[PDB]
Design a binder for these strands. Sequence first.
RNA 1: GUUCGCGAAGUAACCCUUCGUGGACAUUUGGUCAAUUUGAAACAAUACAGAGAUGAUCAGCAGUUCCCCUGCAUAAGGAUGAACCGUUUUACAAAGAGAUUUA
Length: 133
Amino acid sequence: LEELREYQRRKRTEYEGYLKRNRLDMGQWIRYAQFEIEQHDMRRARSIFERALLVDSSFIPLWIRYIDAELKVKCINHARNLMNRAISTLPRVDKLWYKYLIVEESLNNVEIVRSLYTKWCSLEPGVNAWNSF
RNA sequence: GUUCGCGAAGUAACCCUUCGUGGACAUUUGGUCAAUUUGAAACAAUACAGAGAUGAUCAGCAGUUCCCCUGCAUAAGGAUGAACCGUUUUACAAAGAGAUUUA
Ligand SMILES: [Mg+2]
Ligand SMILES: [Mg+2]
């Protein structure tokens, strides 16, 4: 196991030595987050995604891959109440509204999208969103 | 222990000693800390490594880090003080062509 244990120790010093000097570079935050997903450790992986939302919270390719981290392992309520934070942060962004719709379409409960489009039409989006409703 | 009053004793022109009693006066220090190995100075020596850029040899000054030492120091030095010069795949589709395939 120490073939793996000092492996996991050595890799975490290499990415966090880099992110120490570059709080930016959102691509390295995602890559170091994906390393901890493959270690089957979602407690550490959620930390890196929360630490990276502090640096930028408008870089929505970070948001979407944190939803994808939660749905691939099929932890569903952690991706559900995440959306109480995500679209209450950025109500104007299209893709954060669309992805929380289509994921609910594949989970097949249309009572939930009956209240989503209720707010999302009270919010007055524009032509491409009203037509999908 | 002092002093004021009281009660006696002995000496006694009520004075000096001594014993027994009431009140007064004076009133809460210090520790975050126990006296060698097991609750934490450092260096020197030895061994290895070697002090930027570049074809090569050199003056340097910065910035970045959950890096410091010397110095009164917001000065100036400390290899241009040190560590950084590694790794990098999805907001993702539009158009078409073939093939597979089913009411
Ligand atoms: Mg310097
Ligand atoms: Mg200097």
